[PDB]
C-alpha cells in the first residue's frame, strides 16, 4: 500500500463512502475510531477492538507524553508494538487536553508550557512526539477556541492556529521518515463564524494537507448549532480529501454529520459511557443499571451481532455493573464499540446503495421512538 490514498467510491448528496489506504491497513469511510487514551482502548484487548470492526484507533498524545513518556515508547519500539495494535493509529496533537486537563498553563506564540495533572508543547514538539509514538495520521498542533467565543478571540485563535498549521507542516516534512510513511491532517477553526471558517479552510488548503479536520465543534454547541456550522463549513474543505469531525459523537450526531460530508469520527462516549452503564441500542440508549433490567434475559440489543449480545443477558450485565465488576466494563465496552461499528457499516452500505437518506430517516424514527 501507499503512504496515503483516499478514494471515494460512492456518493449520495454530501455523503461519501470510500477508503483510506495506508501502509498499516485500509480504513473504510465513514469511519469511527475507538479512543485509546494511555495506550489502551479501555477494557479491551486490541484483538477485541479489531473484532468489532474497527480499522483504526485514536491515541491521545497528551496522556502518552505524561505516562509512559514519548521517548520511552520510542525506545520500546513505538506505540503499535507497545500496545499490540498493528493497524493505523491517528494521534491528536495533545493541545486540547493541555487546555482541558493541565494546570498553570502558559500560552504564547511559540507554544504552551504546563503542569501535569512541567511539560511543553509546540507545533514542532507535538509533531516530534507523534513521530516518536509512530503515528500513522498526525494532527497539526493548534490553539482551541472555547464556546462561546467572541469574534475577535475566535479570529485571533484561528489565525494563530493557521500559523501553527504551517509550522506543523514544515516540522513533519523535514523529518523524512515521518513524511514518507505517515500522513498529516490540518484542523479548521473559526468557532461558529462562517467568515472565519472560510479563512481557515483557505489557509489550510493553501498549505496543503492529507486530510482536513473540523475542530472546535464539540465544546458545548448543541446539535442544531453544530449542524448549522457544518452546513457551510464542510463544503469549504477540499472535496477529494478526508473530512474529520473531532470529538463527535452520539449516533444521531454521526448520521447527521455524514449527511453533511464528514468521513471520520472519534469519541469517548461508547467506551466511557459504557463503563458508566449506558448501552447503545437501535431503539436508543439504555442505562443497564436501572432496576428494570435485573431479570431481563434479552441481550443488550435485539439485533446486534456482537459476542456480548450472543452470550450474555441484560440481567447479567446489570449485575456486574451494579457490583462494580471489571467484566461489566469489558462487556459494555465491547458491545458499544461493536454497535458503533455496525452503525458505520450500515452508513457505508446505504451510501453505496444510494439509500442513505432513507436509512437516516428510519434510524431516527426508531432510535427516538
Which candidate in 55, 136, 263, 266 is catalytic? 266
Is 55 an annotated catalytic residue?
no
Q: Choose between 306 and 347: whose C-beta lies nearer to Zn ion.
A: 306
Q: Choose between 24 and 80: whose C-beta lies nearer to a copy of itself.
A: 80
Write each residue from 68 to 87 as x if it is in contact with a copy of itself (CB under 8 A), else as -, in one continuous string: x---x--xxx----xxx---
Write each residue from 172 to 191 as x if it is in contact with a copy of itself (CB under 8 A), else as -, in one continuous string: --------------------
Tell me if 326 contacts a copy of itself by CB under 8 A: yes
Beta bridge partners of 15: 12
3-state secondary structure of 143: coil
Determine if residue 357 is labeled as part of a ligand binding site: no
Determine if residue 173 is labeled as part of a ligand binding site: no
Selected from 173, 239, 295, 353, the binder of a copy of itself by CB under 8 A is 295
Query: C-alpha angle with apex 139: 187 to 55, nearest 5 degrees?
Result: 110
Q: Choose between 213 and 332: whose C-beta lies nearer to a copy of itself.
A: 332
Which residues touch 147 (CB under 8 Å, ≥6 apart)? 191, 192, 216, 219, 220, 221
- List the interface residues with a copy of itself, window 115-174 (CB under 8 A): none
Sheet holding 243-245, edge to edge: 31-33, 264-266, 243-245, 211-214, 183-188, 137-139, 89-91, 57-59, 35-36
> Quick one: which of 99, 89, 12 has its CA closest to 46?
89
Determine if residue 157 is labeled as part of a ligand binding site: no
Selected from 315, 345, 346, 349, the binder of a copy of itself by CB under 8 A is 315
Q: 192 touches which of Zn ion, a copy of itself, none (CB within 5 to 8 A by kind)?
A: none
Which residues touch 77 (CB under 8 Å, ≥6 apart)? none
According to DSSP H, which parts of the chain are helical? 46-51, 61-66, 70-75, 79-83, 95-101, 123-133, 151-174, 176-181, 194-207, 223-233, 251-259, 274-275, 307-311, 314-322, 326-352, 356-367
Burial (CB count <10 Å: 0-12, 13-18, 19+), residue 346:
middle
Q: Choose between 3 and 322: whose C-beta lies nearer to a copy of itself.
A: 322
Q: 100 touches which of a copy of itself, Zn ion, none (CB within 5 to 8 A by kind)?
A: none
Least Å distance between CB 333 and a copy of itself?
Answer: 9
Sheet holding 119-121, edge to edge: 103-108, 111-115, 119-121
CB 275 within 8 A of CB 332: yes
> Quick one: which of 178, 233, 187, 235 has its CA closest to 211?
187
Beta bridge partners of 137: 90, 183
Residues that bind Zn ion (CB under 5 A): 304, 306, 308-309, 335
Is 136 an annotated catalytic residue?
no
Which candidate in 55, 92, 253, 263 is catalytic? 92
Determine if residue 335 is labeled as part of a ligand binding site: yes
Count the residues of the shown chain that bind a copy of itself, applying the rule CB under 8 A: 33
Selected from 14, 45, 50, 163, the binder of a copy of itself by CB under 8 A is 45
Least Å distance between CB 91 and a copy of itself?
Answer: 17
Tell me if 284 contacts a copy of itself by CB under 8 A: no
> Quick one: which of 132, 211, 205, 194 has its CA closest to 162?
205
Determine if residue 93 is labeled as part of a ligand binding site: yes
Least Å distance between CB 332 and Zn ion?
Answer: 10
Tell me if 268 contacts a copy of itself by CB under 8 A: no
Binding site for a copy of itself (CB under 8 A): 38-40, 42-45, 67-68, 72, 75-77, 82-84, 294-295, 297, 311-313, 315-316, 319-320, 322-323, 325-327, 329-330
Active site residues: 92, 266
Q: Which residues are annotated as a binding site?
A: 92-96, 142, 189, 216, 304, 306, 309, 335
Amino acid at each position: 500500500r501507499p503512504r496515503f490514498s483516499f478514494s471515494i467510491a460512492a456518493r449520495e448528496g454530501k455523503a461519501r463512502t470510500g477508503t483510506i489506504e495506508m501502509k498499516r491497513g485500509v480504513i473504510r469511510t465513514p469511519a469511527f475510531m475507538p479512543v485509546g487514551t494511555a495506550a489502551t482502548v479501555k477494557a479491551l484487548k486490541p484483538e477485541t477492538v479489531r473484532a468489532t470492526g474497527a480499522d483504526i484507533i485514536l491515541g491521545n498524545t497528551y496522556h502518552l507524553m505524561l505516562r509512559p513518556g514519548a521517548e520511552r515508547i520510542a525506545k520500546l519500539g513505538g506505540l503499535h508494538s507497545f500496545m499490540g495494535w498493528d493497524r493505523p493509529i491517528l494521534t491528536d496533537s495533545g493541545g486540547y487536553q493541555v487546555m482541558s486537563l493541565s494546570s498553570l498553563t502558559k500560552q504564547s506564540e511559540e507554544g504552551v508550557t504546563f503542569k501535569s495533572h512541567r511539560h511543553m508543547l509546540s507545533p514542532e514538539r507535538s509533531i516530534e512526539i507523534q513521530h516518536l509514538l509512530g503515528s500513522d495520521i498526525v494532527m497539526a498542533f493548534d490553539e482551541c477556541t472555547p464556546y462561546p467565543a467572541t469574534p475577535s478571540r475566535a479570529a485571533s485563535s484561528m489565525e494563530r492556529s493557521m500559523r501553527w498549521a504551517k509550522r506543523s507542516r514544515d516540522a513533519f516534512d523535514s523529518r523524512k521518515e515521518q513524511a514518507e510513511n505517515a500522513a498529516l491532517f490540518g484542523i479548521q477553526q473559526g468557532s461558529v463564524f462562517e467568515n472565519l471558517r472560510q479563512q481557515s479552510a483557505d489557509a489550510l488548503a493553501e498549505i496543503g494537507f492529507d486530510g482536513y479536520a473540523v475542530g472546535g465543534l464539540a465544546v458545548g454547541q448543541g446539535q442544531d448549532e453544530m449542524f448549522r456550522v457544518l452546513d457551510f463549513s464542510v463544503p469549504m474543505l477540499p472535496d477529494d480529501k478526508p473530512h474529520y469531525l473531532m470529538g463527535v459523537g452520539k449516533p444521531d450526531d454521526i448520521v447527521g454529520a455524514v449527511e453533511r460530508g464528514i468521513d471520520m469520527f472519534d469519541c469517548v462516549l461508547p467506551t466511557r459511557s459504557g463503563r458508566n452503564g449506558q448501552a447503545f441500542t437501535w431503539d436508543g440508549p439504555i442505562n443497564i443499571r436501572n432496576a428494570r433490567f435485573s431479570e431481563d434475559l434479552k441481550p443488550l440489543d435485539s439485533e446486534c451481532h456482537c459476542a456480548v449480545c450472543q452470550k450474555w443477558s441484560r440481567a447479567y450485565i446489570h449485575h456486574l455493573i451494579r457490583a462494580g465488576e471489571i467484566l461489566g466494563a469489558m462487556l459494555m465496552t465491547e458491545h458499544n464499540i461493536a454497535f458503533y461499528q455496525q452503525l458505520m457499516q450500515k452508513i457505508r452500505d446505504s451510501i453505496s446503495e444510494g439509500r442513505f437518506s432513507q436509512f437516516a430517516q428510519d434510524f431516527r424514527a426508531r432510535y427516538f421512538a
